[PDB]
Design a protein around this motif. Structure first.
Motif, short mmCIF file in Angstrom:
data_model
loop_
_atom_site.label_atom_id
_atom_site.label_comp_id
_atom_site.label_asym_id
_atom_site.label_seq_id
_atom_site.Cartn_x
_atom_site.Cartn_y
_atom_site.Cartn_z
N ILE A 1 0.83 -1.20 0.00
CA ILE A 1 0.00 0.00 0.00
C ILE A 1 0.87 1.26 0.00
CG2 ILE A 1 -1.93 1.15 1.11
CD1 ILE A 1 -2.51 -1.62 -0.06
N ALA A 2 1.89 1.28 0.86
CA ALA A 2 2.75 2.44 0.99
C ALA A 2 3.54 2.71 -0.29
CB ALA A 2 3.70 2.25 2.17
N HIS A 3 4.11 1.66 -0.89
CA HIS A 3 4.88 1.84 -2.10
C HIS A 3 3.99 2.22 -3.27
CE1 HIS A 3 6.51 -0.08 -5.90
NE2 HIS A 3 7.23 1.01 -5.73
N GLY A 4 2.76 1.69 -3.34
CA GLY A 4 1.84 2.12 -4.38
C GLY A 4 1.54 3.61 -4.30
N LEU A 5 1.24 4.09 -3.09
CA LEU A 5 0.94 5.51 -2.91
C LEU A 5 2.15 6.39 -3.23
CD1 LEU A 5 -1.32 5.42 0.25
CD2 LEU A 5 -1.90 6.54 -1.91
N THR A 6 3.32 6.04 -2.68
CA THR A 6 4.48 6.91 -2.86
C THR A 6 5.05 6.82 -4.27
OG1 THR A 6 6.51 7.68 -1.79
CG2 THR A 6 6.27 5.30 -2.05
N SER A 7 4.90 5.67 -4.95
CA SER A 7 5.35 5.57 -6.32
C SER A 7 4.44 6.33 -7.26
CB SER A 7 5.44 4.10 -6.73
OG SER A 7 4.25 3.41 -6.42
N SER A 8 3.12 6.29 -7.01
CA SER A 8 2.21 7.11 -7.79
C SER A 8 2.51 8.59 -7.61
CB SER A 8 0.76 6.79 -7.41
OG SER A 8 0.34 5.57 -7.98
N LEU A 9 2.81 9.01 -6.37
CA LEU A 9 3.15 10.40 -6.13
C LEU A 9 4.45 10.79 -6.83
CD1 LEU A 9 2.73 13.11 -4.84
CD2 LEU A 9 3.37 12.15 -2.63
N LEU A 10 5.45 9.90 -6.82
CA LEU A 10 6.72 10.18 -7.49
C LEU A 10 6.54 10.30 -9.00
CD1 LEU A 10 9.23 7.95 -5.50
CD2 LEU A 10 9.29 10.44 -5.71
N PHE A 11 5.76 9.38 -9.60
CA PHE A 11 5.51 9.49 -11.03
C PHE A 11 4.70 10.73 -11.37
CE2 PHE A 11 6.44 4.85 -11.15
CZ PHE A 11 7.35 4.85 -12.18
N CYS A 12 3.81 11.16 -10.47
CA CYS A 12 3.07 12.40 -10.72
C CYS A 12 3.98 13.62 -10.71
CB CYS A 12 1.97 12.58 -9.68
SG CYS A 12 0.62 11.48 -9.94
N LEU A 13 4.91 13.68 -9.76
CA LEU A 13 5.84 14.80 -9.73
C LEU A 13 6.75 14.79 -10.95
CD1 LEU A 13 6.42 14.34 -5.98
CD2 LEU A 13 5.85 16.58 -6.91
N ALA A 14 7.22 13.60 -11.35
CA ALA A 14 8.03 13.48 -12.56
C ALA A 14 7.24 13.88 -13.80
CB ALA A 14 8.55 12.05 -12.69
N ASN A 15 5.96 13.52 -13.86
CA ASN A 15 5.14 13.87 -15.02
C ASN A 15 4.82 15.35 -15.05
OD1 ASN A 15 3.32 12.88 -17.34
ND2 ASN A 15 1.90 14.04 -16.05
N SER A 16 4.67 15.99 -13.89
CA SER A 16 4.51 17.44 -13.86
C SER A 16 5.75 18.13 -14.40
CB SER A 16 4.21 17.91 -12.44
OG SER A 16 5.39 18.01 -11.68
N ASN A 17 6.93 17.66 -13.99
CA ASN A 17 8.17 18.22 -14.54
C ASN A 17 8.30 17.93 -16.03
OD1 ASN A 17 9.28 19.61 -12.42
ND2 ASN A 17 10.49 17.89 -11.65
N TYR A 18 7.82 16.77 -16.47
CA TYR A 18 7.89 16.41 -17.88
C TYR A 18 6.94 17.26 -18.72
CZ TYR A 18 7.20 13.71 -22.15
OH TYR A 18 7.09 13.31 -23.46
N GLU A 19 5.76 17.57 -18.20
CA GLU A 19 4.86 18.47 -18.91
C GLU A 19 5.35 19.90 -18.88
OE1 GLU A 19 0.99 17.90 -17.27
OE2 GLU A 19 0.69 15.94 -18.22
N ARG A 20 6.17 20.27 -17.89
CA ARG A 20 6.80 21.58 -17.91
C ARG A 20 7.87 21.67 -18.99
NH1 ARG A 20 3.12 22.01 -14.92
NH2 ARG A 20 2.83 23.64 -13.34
N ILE A 21 8.87 20.78 -18.93
CA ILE A 21 10.09 20.96 -19.72
C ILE A 21 10.13 20.13 -20.99
CG2 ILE A 21 11.24 21.32 -17.51
CD1 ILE A 21 12.83 18.78 -18.02
N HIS A 22 9.14 19.26 -21.23
CA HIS A 22 9.07 18.36 -22.38
C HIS A 22 10.33 17.51 -22.51
CE1 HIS A 22 5.19 19.50 -23.80
NE2 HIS A 22 5.52 20.77 -23.96
N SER A 23 10.82 17.02 -21.38
CA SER A 23 12.00 16.17 -21.36
C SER A 23 11.98 15.30 -20.12
CB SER A 23 13.29 17.00 -21.39
OG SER A 23 14.40 16.21 -20.99
N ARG A 24 12.68 14.17 -20.20
CA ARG A 24 12.74 13.21 -19.11
C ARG A 24 14.13 13.10 -18.50
NH1 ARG A 24 10.09 10.21 -22.34
NH2 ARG A 24 11.85 8.78 -22.66
N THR A 25 15.04 14.01 -18.85
CA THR A 25 16.41 13.94 -18.37
C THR A 25 16.48 14.25 -16.88
OG1 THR A 25 17.02 14.75 -20.56
CG2 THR A 25 18.77 14.59 -18.92
N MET A 26 17.26 13.45 -16.16
CA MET A 26 17.35 13.56 -14.70
C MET A 26 18.03 14.86 -14.30
SD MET A 26 16.50 11.91 -12.02
CE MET A 26 16.63 12.48 -10.34
#
Ligand SMILES: CCCCCCCCCCCCCCCCCC(=O)OC[C@H](COP(=O)([O-])OCC(O)COP(=O)([O-])OC[C@@H](COC(=O)CCCCCCCCCCCCCCCCC)OC(=O)CCCCCCCCCCCCCCCCC)OC(=O)CCCCCCCCCCCCCCCCC
Ligand SMILES: CCCCCCCCCCCCCCCCCC(=O)OC[C@H](COP(=O)([O-])OCC(O)COP(=O)([O-])OC[C@@H](COC(=O)CCCCCCCCCCCCCCCCC)OC(=O)CCCCCCCCCCCCCCCCC)OC(=O)CCCCCCCCCCCCCCCCC
Ligand SMILES: CCCCCCCCCCCCCCCCCC(=O)OC[C@H](COP(=O)([O-])OCC[N+](C)(C)C)OC(=O)CCCCCCCCCCCCCCCCC
Ligand SMILES: CCCCCCCCCCCCCCCCCC(=O)OC[C@H](COP(=O)(O)OCCN)OC(=O)CCCCCCCCCCCCCCCCC
Ligand SMILES: CCCCCCCCCCCCCCCCCC(=O)OC[C@H](COP(=O)(O)OCCN)OC(=O)CCCCCCCCCCCCCCCCC
Ligand SMILES: CCCCCCCCCCCCCCCCCC(=O)OC[C@H](COP(=O)(O)OCCN)OC(=O)CCCCCCCCCCCCCCCCC
Ligand SMILES: CCCCCCCCCCCCCCCCCC(=O)OC[C@H](COP(=O)(O)OCCN)OC(=O)CCCCCCCCCCCCCCCCC
Lengths: 606, 106, 178, 169, 459
Positions: E317-342
């Motif tokens: 349960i914990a990893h599902g919630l925190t992994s979904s949150l991490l992918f959401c933050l990464a996707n927000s950054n991806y929709e900002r900068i149109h890139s996936r570079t770390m």
């Protein structure tokens, strides 16, 4: 029974109150640093009440305020073991933190996130009180990592600084290795005693506790920055000075020592653990004093002073003297709070200038800060009848009079002499000689928010050791029948160190260049441990990671093994099986072969 | 050597534009356009003590006495020190005194 | 910082850099001002003694030997100014150096909180609009046909004109933004 | 609400105050002020709350389950009485878990009450804890995550067979 | 369970009959009501299991997964609202239908009382993830990633189907409670060993086990945000639930057939944490962190301690919630900068303070900060693994150290440091995505406050 618990949880409620005020959207209309400072001083008064009660009746308390969860035969409950250590460290930490937040209100002026800084300090204080007063190892572990993470944030306060981010990351790394040791000890105690409760630990005192004591020793080494895991503290000096003081000087660094004091009945029954604690503490105080002898940044010098005094506590815990170690915890907290606050006032008056080579004439240009710095240096070295006399001298007599390692004893005495020598180096190169700072005088220490916390910490560093040590209930019987050279050993070596460093500083004043030697190169270059280890271990770790793990395994060999191999095999089979020439002659020859084969299988099956 | 004339002229023009930009960074006196003290002992500290301490002290005391003492082993304290010559308040028996102390050299 | 490095450092530039580094490490060792003045005068006397060399290969060898001596006798912790790289206040305020293009994303209420400053901001933006095409034309005109070019940039060559690529230099955040 | 039959507590023995000094006691002064300012309004509010409770008083009962046939008198494959015996066993397992929690709280309370005399005066609590943990290890240990009445019966039968074999000589 | 399945089923006509300017609002609000209705399965006032019908049931393990799926569906719609704003109405409604089909079929999958129905719903859930990843993925490697994911999972799942049919023929009904009651011991023969492997490898692929984990990073990278959520937060835990359901009828030979998979899991979480240290893609780094966490879940489930099963449940349960949150933050950054570079976006703490705060709490949950359910799962898994063997603590310690290192490396290189001032296309924040982070992070706090809900079957 009610007033005691009400006072303790009122300390906690008054600590949590400014956090709710911060998130309650009324900060823009109130003075948040002043409000938080008043909150800490009131928390100090309601913390002073059970100090008086325990000094009267010596009542030992356990409070189970909230049952969190019941898990088959193991109840995780949020509970506080209100100890002598818990009460006295609560009072000392609240007094120190009141001083640090008043100094923070003075020092972090013209800063856009002064409220952010104050809230971070308050959250760190909450986590430190949780760690100090926690009854069970899970709650103490909550405090442990809360303190570690808020240390990370406060070191990386100036988050635009790459060096600050690096120092915060390596502080996290060493605290994480300490967390691994703590997890080993916690897991062993859960498996062998069904709980993390200190009462069942006390019942566990009568067996072989070698593995959990090793785990607690590793945790304390990581938290208190002993040898092997030391340089995260002088790197952690990178953050602001109130962070340096409160975090790395008085409260956080003594958390591993505090944990060892908590587990001292287990510690007393294991002689191997006691010997390795004594040896590790003597080695780390010797090494940190050696490093402190030649540093130029004043914050680094008093940080290595902090680490050397932590090594002295670690020696004292190598002996069967935990209460002396906790007395030195409170004593050291007072001293380093005041010394760091004085150094921060020096830096702010000299416009963010930090190393002692551009200072001087501080006795004449900043008399109040000079007097308080002299008080701190003398009382840290162990001037008699100050706050440091009632812990450090008793530690020196204990190590001189009880059966210890001879080399550990010798290097402890030499480390005390070096403590005198770098205190002399601070006094000389800051408060004495001619000015060396840039000419424009911007010194203005006339602020009450600057003076008053130093006044309170000066009253602490003069009288608090005397008052506390005369209010301690009698335990850990010292020995007083002892020869005169052993009795005056600490004072004699402190005077000798002061004289030696004075004549060495006069030799530096003398007009002659000398060729540097590897001893001073070793001392100035941090013992080569940060450079060597922080270059060879990250390089090997990240090189192994990229070159082997990702590249080789994932991007080469698992791909070559399962999926691309299956695809290549099926591609080869489908090409070989449907490379058909399209000739009905060949197709009917194939059909004839099929007919012959099926007749053969019928003949062999029957 | 010194400045070449091209870079010297470029720095002079860039610095003059920097002076103009930094002057334009100033704030006019009307910006930003936003849309019972007594003595410190009697109102600054007294109101704080009766508001942010007294009501929390009430709530903690209520929770402690009516939700912890009602439960068996929440508040458990050690036995107090009992000395010879003392009188027990709860029981009513006096502890007998010690022996005759043969050594009184100091 | 305000000038771009060349393709290579000349011998004279290397000698000056070695002299400055040697005197800085000398003050790090000497600490006291009179001691540093004495030994810095000695170092200046040494440099003046080796100043008049004509063969220049002997001068390069002397420079190599001198910097070898410097690396042998350098301070383990030389004095660093707080704003210098490797110092204590270096990059301390990059967390506060907010770039100016966030005011384009500011809300109209926040813009109305500072009307006159924002009006000056679109005046500066309009000036940038008017000057960009002219400075691009100047950069295209002044580019040499040869492959040789440095990182230096031309100034404005007539009245009513701005230096090319002036925006990121003029509108940089302050080193004390707050 | 709790009873000393299941949460035993020795009677307190506090000494009478014998102040040799003439200085006033700030703890006594602050305690008297603490009652007069805090304890009286809190107990007034609680008395109002308690008389409101007495005005609206309700009752609840502790549920009791009768003894279904145990799994030993229960045929294999007949999943009805298998299910009944298994949920009875799970209920008794949870009850034994809470019994263990009770004994552990007793041991912790003894240790905190005795303090420095815990190595001598907690002999009875430690003996009770040792006996109950030996019984718990005999009945429930090493069952696994899929612990059940059948697995407990198999472990008990194996232990009884081992004891019977050891009792021959 | 029908009172949750039917309105989620009726979400589809609402999706296809709503106005194009009201579809997102109506479906999001009604799916929030679906989650609220699905919260009624926590009414467990007895040790008995909620057997609603002859086909559906609720369990202390099945209930948190169902509630998690019903909670993620409106969050899925919220995350999918932004990158479909330039997209056709019919395709928008189709995507919403695909997500709703995921949510329905996963509730039936977790609530099924039959393993064959569980398998049917298993790859019935596999199909729309394939369709989502393949159609709405961005890069050109989405087709390859879908092929890899589908065929790892199906080559896993075919021997599971054969093992299930063999178990049905041997026993008679394949009902979960009937199997749990009339469980028969195995003879530890080669046929039983191969049967054990056949019924284990499908869920081991879906976990994914180390060595066979290669489908996950590319699928998570080339997947959209809803596909990344559904994979990292439901499907791995679905393989987890599959092993927990199937392990009851595999005594006693799991005590030695557990050996290679425990070693693979421990060394693989170390390996993938090292990859997280030396990873240049944010989505790849979060994917390998997920691989390490599910490797911990494998170790717990295979050592089969009750404390391990609980730690696996809370880590699910914990990893599902925190992994979904991490992918959401990464996707927000991806929709900002149109890139996936770390490393490309560095100083986002300056421009986005609240989003950097959400980043910090997400990473702190990732690195097991106390007293969160993340650390409760890892600590109880640690305790059970040390009980299983005392030398597991070395691998656990290395994994935890590198976990803290990659989480803080994420924070330092994505938030801290100097700001990349050339990124002038940085919109401040959407209330939608800030709400998405808040709705991801608040249930973590609530489950930290009350951890008894996700303890699972054992306690
Ligand atoms: C026993 C103890 C157990 C726990 C121990 C934990 C130890 C470790 C702690 C690590 C802390 C790490 C850290 O630095 O966190 C910073 C983090 C916030 O970072 P920040 O830099 O302030 O972010 C602000 C932005 O940068 C810039 O925004 P701003 O500057 O304008 O700030 C305005 C302020 C404004 O704050 C708000 O608006 C508050 C938002 C929540 C309101 C809830 C209202 C509920 C009403 C019910 C009726 O916003 C914030 O402070 C952050 C907003 C988000 C906070 C979310 C926290 C969880 C909320 C859960 C709600 C559950 C509701 C259930 C129903 O702090 C928190 O999240 C809360 C404080 C720490 C935890 C609580 C205190 C300790 C435990 C007490 C029990
Ligand atoms: C002169 C004036 C003097 C005034 C004196 C005080 C008078 C007064 O207010 O009396 C209380 C008065 C009557 O007292 P009473 O009837 O004797 O109390 C019986 C209980 O309320 C009976 O309980 P209840 O269930 O009826 O209501 C209490 C319930 C209320 O709960 C709710 O209402 C549910 C939530 C609603 C959220 C809505 C948004 O709270 C709970 O169930 C637990 C709350 C726990 C909150 C803190 C959680 C900490 C988590 C820590 C995590 C980390 C642990 C680490 C452990 C480490 C070691 C292993 O009213 C209440 O009790 C109502 C309290 C409402 C609280 C609201 C805020 C929290 C929610
Ligand atoms: C994703 C993983 C892929 C690789 C591993 C696949 C699973 C490996 C373990 C299981 C064996 C293969 C599947 C059989 C399923 C049924 C098992 C079963 O019921 O066992 C008991 C049965 C025995 O039944 P029994 O129990 O009735 O035995 C008779 C016993 N008496 C007589 C006493 C009553 O085992 C089998 O029948 C197994 C025969 C399998 C032969 C065919 C194998 C083909 C290849 C399989 C893998 C192909 C994909 C991978 C290729 C490589 C890719 C890189
Ligand atoms: C008498 C008895 C004596 C006994 C002595 C025993 C000694 C034991 C010593 C144990 C610990 C050794 C390893 C410590 C590694 C620390 C690495 C580190 O944080 O280095 C920091 C470094 C940069 O920092 P620095 O160079 O200090 O400062 C630059 C400022 N401009 O670099 C970085 O910041 C790099 C960022 C991190 C990169 C990834 C690191 C991953 C490490 C994984 C380790 C896994 C194994 C751990 C084993 C621990 C065993 C205890
Ligand atoms: C540690 C555990 C170890 C044990 C477990 C190991 C197994 C794990 C699970 C197996 C995973 C297999 C993954 C297979 C798919 C990946 C390969 C792939 O994607 O190949 C693509 C390629 C076609 O590519 P194409 O699209 O044409 O062109 C490229 C771009 N246009 O495709 C081709 O060229 C051909 C692809 C053919 C189809 C592949 C999928 C089906 C494979 C069936 C295998 C049957 C095995 C048994 C056979 C009978 C016995 C011999
Ligand atoms: C944040 C700090 C949280 C501390 C833990 C929770 C405190 C409140 C609490 O215990 O509330 C629950 C209690 C009723 O609990 P009970 O009747 O035992 O049954 C539980 C089943 N619902 O409910 C009540 O007692 C209702 C009356 C509460 C009156 C207000 C109490 C406020 C002061 C609490 C101080 C706690 C300090 C703990 C500090 C820990 C470290 C941060
Ligand atoms: C990837 C790493 C693979 C190697 C890991 C290290 C060796 C593990 C060996 C092992 O699992 O041994 C268990 C068992 C030992 O044999 P035993 O318990 O006597 O079984 C009697 C069977 N007639 O061995 C056996 O029963 C033999 C068959 C073991 C098969 C284990 C799984 C193989 C790999 C599947 C992928």
């Amino acid at each position: 029974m009610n007033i005691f618990t009400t006072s303790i949880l009122l300390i906690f409620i008054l600590l949590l109150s400014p956090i709710l005020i911060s998130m309650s959207n009324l900060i823009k209309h109130i003075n948040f640093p002043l409000y938080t400072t008043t909150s800490i001083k009131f928390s100090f008064i309601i913390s002073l009440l059970p100090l008086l009660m325990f000094f009267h009746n010596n009542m030992e308390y356990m409070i189970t305020t909230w049952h969190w969860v019941t898990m088959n035969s193991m109840e995780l409950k949020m509970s506080f073991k209100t100890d002598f250590f818990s009460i006295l460290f609560t009072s000392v930490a609240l007094f120190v933190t009141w001083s640090i937040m008043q100094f923070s209100s003075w020092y972090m002026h013209s800063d856009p996130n002064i409220n952010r800084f104050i809230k971070y300090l308050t959250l760190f204080l909450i986590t430190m009180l949780i760690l100090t007063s926690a009854n069970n190892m899970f709650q103490l572990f909550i405090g442990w990592e809360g303190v570690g993470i808020m240390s990370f944030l406060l070191i990386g306060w100036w988050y635009g600084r790459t060096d600050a981010n690096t120092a915060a990351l390596q502080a996290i790394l060493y605290n994480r290795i300490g967390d691994i040791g703590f997890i080993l000890a916690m897991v062993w105690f859960s498996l062998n005693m069904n709980s993390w409760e200190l009462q069942q630990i006390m019942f566990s005192n009568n067996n072989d506790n070698l593995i959990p004591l090793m785990g607690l020793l590793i945790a304390a080494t990581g938290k208190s920055a002993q040898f092997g895991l030391h340089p995260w503290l002088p790197s952690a000096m990178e953050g602001p000075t109130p962070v340096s003081a409160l975090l790395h000087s008085s409260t956080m660094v003594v958390a591993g020592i505090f944990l060892l004091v908590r587990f001292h009945p287990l510690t007393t029954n294991n002689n191997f653990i006691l010997t390795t604690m004594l040896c590790l503490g003597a080695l780390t105080t010797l090494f940190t004093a050696i490093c402190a002898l030649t540093q130029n940044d004043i914050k680094k010098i008093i940080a290595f002073s902090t680490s050397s005094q932590l090594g002295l506590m670690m020696v004292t815990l190598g002996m069967n003297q935990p209460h002396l170690a906790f007395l030195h915890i409170c004593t050291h907290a007072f001293f380093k709070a005041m010394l760091f606050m004085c150094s921060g006032s020096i830096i702010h008056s000299l416009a963010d200038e930090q190393d002692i080579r551009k200072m001087g004439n501080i006795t004449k240009i900043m008399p109040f800060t000079s007097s308080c710095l002299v008080i701190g240096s003398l009382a840290l070295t162990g001037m008699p009848f100050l706050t440091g006399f009632y812990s450090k001298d008793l530690i020196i007599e204990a190590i001189n009079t009880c059966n210890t390692n001879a080399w550990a004893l010798l290097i402890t005495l030499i480390a005390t002499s070096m403590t005198a020598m770098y205190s002399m180096r601070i006094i000389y190169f800051v408060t004495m000689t001619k000015p060396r700072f840039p000419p424009l005088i911007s010194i203005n220490e006339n602020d009450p928010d600057l003076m008053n916390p130093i006044k309170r910490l000066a009253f602490g560093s003069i009288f608090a050791g005397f008052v506390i040590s005369y209010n301690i209930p009698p335990t850990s019987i010292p020995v007083l029948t002892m020869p005169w050279f052993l009795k005056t050993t600490a004072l004699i070596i402190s005077v000798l160190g002061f004289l030696i460093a004075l004549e060495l500083n006069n030799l530096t004043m003398k007009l002659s260049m000398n060729k540097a030697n590897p001893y001073s190169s070793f001392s100035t270059l941090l013992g080569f441990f940060p450079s060597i280890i922080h270059r060879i271990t990250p390089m090997k770790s990240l090189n192994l990671s990229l070159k082997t793990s990702l590249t080789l395994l994932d991007l080469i060999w698992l791909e070559k093994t399962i999926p691309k191999s299956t695809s290549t095999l099926h591609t080869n089979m489908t090409t070989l099986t449907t490379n058909q020439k399209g000739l009905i002659k060949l197709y009917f020859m194939s059909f004839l072969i099929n007919i012959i084969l099926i007749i053969i299988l019928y003949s062999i099956n029957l | 050597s010194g400045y070449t004339p091209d870079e010297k002229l470029r720095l002079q023009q860039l610095r003059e534009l920097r002076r103009r930009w930094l002057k334009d960074q100033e704030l006019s006196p009307r910006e930003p356009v936003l849309p019972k003290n007594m003595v410190f002992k009697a109102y600054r500290s007294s109101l704080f003590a009766v508001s942010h301490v007294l009501i929390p002290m009430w709530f903690v005391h209520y929770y402690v006495k009516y939700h912890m003492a009602t439960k068996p082993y929440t508040i458990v304290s050690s036995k107090p020190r009992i000395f010879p010559g003392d009188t027990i308040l709860e029981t009513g028996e006096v502890i007998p005194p010690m022996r005759d102390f043969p050594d009184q050299h100091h | 910082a305000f000038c771009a490095p060349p393709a290579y450092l000349t011998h004279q530039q290397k000698v000056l850099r070695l002299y400055k580094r040697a005197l800085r490490h000398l003050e790090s060792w000497c600490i006291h001002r009179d001691k540093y003045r004495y030994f810095a005068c000695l170092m200046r006397a040494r440099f003046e003694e080796h100043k008049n060399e004509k063969d220049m290969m002997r001068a390069t060898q002397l420079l190599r030997e001198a910097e070898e001596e410097f690396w042998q006798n350098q301070h383990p912790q030389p004095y660093i100014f707080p704003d210098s790289p490797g110092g204590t206040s270096f990059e301390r305020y990059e967390c506060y150096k907010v770039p100016e293009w966030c005011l384009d994303y500011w809300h109209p209420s926040e813009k109305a909180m500072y009307p006159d400053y924002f009006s000056k901001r679109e005046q500066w933006k309009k000036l940038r609009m008017e000057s960009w095409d002219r400075e691009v034309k100047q950069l295209q005109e002044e580019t040499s046909p040869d492959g040789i070019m440095t990182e230096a940039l031309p100034p404005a060559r007539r009245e009513g004109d701005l230096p090319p690529l002036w925006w990121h230099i003029v509108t940089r955040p302050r080193e004390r933004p707050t | 609400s709790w009873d000393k039959d299941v949460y035993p507590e020795p009677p307190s023995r506090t000494p009478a105050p014998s102040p040799q000094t003439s200085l006033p006691n700030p703890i006594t002064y602050l305690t008297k002020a603490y009652d007069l300012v805090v304890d009286w309004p809190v107990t007034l509010v609680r008395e109002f709350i308690e008389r409101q409770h007495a005005k609206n008083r309700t009752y609840y009962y502790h549920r009791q389950y009768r003894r279904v046939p145990d799994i030993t008198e229960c045929k294999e494959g007949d999943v009805l009485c298998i299910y009944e015996a298994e949920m009875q066993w799970r209920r008794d397992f949870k009850v034994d878990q809470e019994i263990m929690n009770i004994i552990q709280e007793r041991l912790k309370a003894c240790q905190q009450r005795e303090g420095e005399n815990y190595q001598q005066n907690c002999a009875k609590e430690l003996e009770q804890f040792t006996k109950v943990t030996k019984a718990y290890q005999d009945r429930y240990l090493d069952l696994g995550a899929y612990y059940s009445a059948r697995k407990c019966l198999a472990k008990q039968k194996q232990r009884m067979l081992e004891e019977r074999k050891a009792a021959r000589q | 369970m029908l009172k949750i399945i039917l309105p989620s089923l009726m979400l589809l006509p609402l999706t296809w009959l709503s106005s194009p300017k009201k579809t997102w609002t109506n479906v999001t609000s009604y799916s929030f009501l679906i989650s609220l209705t699905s919260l009624t399965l926590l009414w467990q006032t007895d040790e008995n299991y909620k057997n609603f019908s002859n086909m559906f049931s609720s369990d202390p393990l099945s209930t948190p997964l169902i509630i998690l799926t019903a909670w993620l569906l409106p969050l899925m719609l919220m995350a999918s609202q932004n990158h479909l704003k330039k997209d056709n109405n019919v395709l928008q409604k189709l995507y919403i239908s695909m997500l709703i089909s995921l949510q329905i079929l996963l509730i039936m999958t977790f609530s099924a009382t039959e393993l064959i129905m569980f398998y049917i719903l298993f790859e019935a859930t596999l199909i729309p993830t394939l369709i989502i990843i393949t159609r709405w993925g961005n890069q050109t490697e989405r087709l390859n990633a879908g092929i890899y994911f589908l065929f790892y999972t199906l080559i896993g799942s075919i021997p599971l189907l054969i093992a299930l049919i063999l178990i049905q023929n041997h026993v008679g009904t394949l009902n979960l409670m009937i199997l749990s009651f009339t469980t028969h011991t195995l003879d530890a023969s080669w046929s039983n060993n191969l049967l054990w492997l056949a019924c284990m490898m499908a869920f081991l692929i879906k976990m994914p086990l180390y060595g066979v984990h290669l489908w996950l990073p590319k699928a998570h990278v080339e997947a959209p945000i809803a596909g990344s959520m559904i994979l990292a937060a439901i499907l791995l835990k679905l393989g987890s639930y599959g092993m927990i359901r199937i392990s009851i009828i595999l005594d006693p030979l799991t005590k030695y057939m557990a050996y290679p998979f425990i070693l693979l899991s421990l060394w693989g979480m170390i390996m993938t944490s090292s990859i997280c240290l030396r990873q240049t893609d944010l989505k790849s780094l979060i994917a390998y962190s997920s691989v390490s966490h599910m490797a911990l879940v494998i170790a717990s489930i295979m050592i089969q301690t009750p404390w391990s099963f609980m730690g696996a449940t809370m880590l699910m349960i914990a990893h599902g919630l925190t992994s979904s949150l991490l992918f959401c933050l990464a996707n927000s950054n991806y929709e900002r900068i149109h890139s996936r570079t770390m490393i490309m976006a560095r100083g986002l703490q300056m421009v986005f303070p609240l989003m950097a705060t959400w980043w910090l709490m997400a990473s702190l949950a990732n690195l097991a900060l106390p007293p969160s359910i993340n650390l409760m799962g890892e600590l109880f898994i640690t305790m059970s693994l040390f009980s299983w063997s005392n030398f597991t603590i070395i691998l656990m310690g290395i994994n935890i150290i590198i976990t803290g290192m990659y989480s803080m490396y994420m924070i330092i290189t994505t938030q801290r440091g100097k700001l990349t001032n050339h990124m002038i296309n940085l919109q401040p924040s959407h209330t939608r995505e800030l709400t998405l982070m808040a709705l991801h992070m608040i249930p973590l706090i609530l489950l930290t406050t009350s951890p008894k809900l996700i303890t699972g079957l054992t306690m």
